[PDB]
């Protein structure tokens, strides 16, 4: 615990999440200093454009909205608040702010662009608040109370292939998927395979392919790639990718080949591809 952190202390510098824009132009970042920096990456060179300050606590995760709604970026934080920054001619102002959860907000994610401009947000109170865009500056919230037992860490929206399904992980060890009926959301299923706190949960984009997959990582140091064999059969069969002796922090899917970027363990990040045999393998070590 305390002993491991003090060993290197390299920093240079601490940051939590940072996501590239659509069209690969911008690169929003956030760090534990409460500062949401938007960089621009034209030709591989990083250039700062704005330092959107406004959170009372460290910003956690950050997500760009689809360019069909103009240029929007949303960031959540340990301050219990979520900020949406619009852009109007270089006017990076916040057009809306939401403070409907009582404990920290571990994660955010945008619904696939067809469903509208829906933002899903998981708190550490055990509640996730979803923001739906209307005509002007009103945003109506669909809140789910007591979604996960001791708090929520991950939120991910599966790519469209109507019915929208969202699977999220939390600190009860359960990776709950979600379904919506008349208007409100209900838990379609629970997924208990982790022996401790689910850190991140990523719903792999479907390559048109109907065999929808989801990846998850936890404090136990295991990565599971849960699979659904067919459309409309409530069977999520987990399969172990690997186990490290240390925690896995983040998991992300590469678009085409379904390559998993496994961030965690020893400050190292691994890349994984499912072989022609169905066993996952490590392609390479990054860094």
């Amino acid at each position: 615990v305390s002993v491991i952190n003090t060993v290197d202390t390299s920093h240079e510098d601490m940051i939590h999440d940072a996501q590239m824009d659509y069209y690969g132009i911008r690169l929003a970042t956030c760090s534990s200093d409460r500062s949401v920096k938007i960089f621009d990456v034209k030709n591989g060179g990083q250039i700062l454009i704005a330092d959107l300050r406004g959170h009372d606590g460290p910003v956690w995760q950050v997500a760009w909205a689809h360019p069909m709604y103009g240029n929007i970026l949303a960031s959540c934080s340990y301050d219990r608040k979520v900020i949406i920054w619009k852009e109007e001619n270089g006017t990076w102002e916040k057009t809306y702010e939401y403070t409907g959860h009582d404990s920290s907000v571990n994660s955010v994610c945008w619904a696939p662009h067809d469903f509208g401009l829906v933002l899903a947000c998981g708190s550490s109170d055990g509640a996730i608040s979803i923001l739906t865009f209307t005509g002007d500056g009103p945003w109506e919230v669909k809140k789910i109370s007591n979604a996960h037992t001791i708090g929520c860490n991950a939120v991910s929206w599966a790519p469209s292939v109507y019915i929208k399904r969202f699977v999220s992980g939390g600190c009860d060890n359960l990776v709950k998927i979600w379904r919506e009926e008349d208007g409100q959301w209900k838990e379609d299923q629970k997924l208990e395979a982790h022996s401790d706190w689910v850190r991140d949960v990523a719903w792999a984009p479907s390559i048109g392919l109907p065999t929808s997959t989801i990846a998850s990582c936890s404090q136990d140091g295991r990565v599971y790639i849960w699979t659904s064999d067919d459309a409309a059969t409530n069977c999520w069969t987990p399969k172990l990718l690997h186990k490290f002796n240390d925690v896995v922090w983040h998991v992300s899917w590469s678009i085409t080949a379904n390559i998993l970027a496994v961030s965690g363990g020893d400050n190292k990040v691994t890349l994984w591809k499912e072989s022609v045999d169905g066993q996952w393998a490590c392609i390479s070590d990054v860094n």
């Binding site: 069209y23 132009i25 069909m68």
Partner: protein, 65 residues
């Protein structure tokens, strides 16, 4: 690529990243308001006619008069 009317769809996306005519191939009213050039406006009116905001179109016709 095998023929489909997917060219307008791709062109429109590029414009958003960085136009109205490409989209054609509320917002139109806003464009007219910005353009409270003349040939382009006439083309826009023609596009509106093809689509057929009727009152707005009538106002545009009056302006043309």
């Amino acid at each position: 690529c095998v023929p489909a009317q997917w060219v307008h769809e791709a062109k429109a996306i590029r414009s958003r990243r960085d136009y109205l005519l490409k989209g054609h191939q509320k917002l139109v009213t806003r464009h007219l308001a910005a353009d409270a050039s003349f040939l382009g406006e006439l083309s826009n009116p023609e596009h509106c006619k093809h689509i057929q905001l009727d009152y707005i179109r009538v106002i545009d016709m009056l302006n043309l008069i």
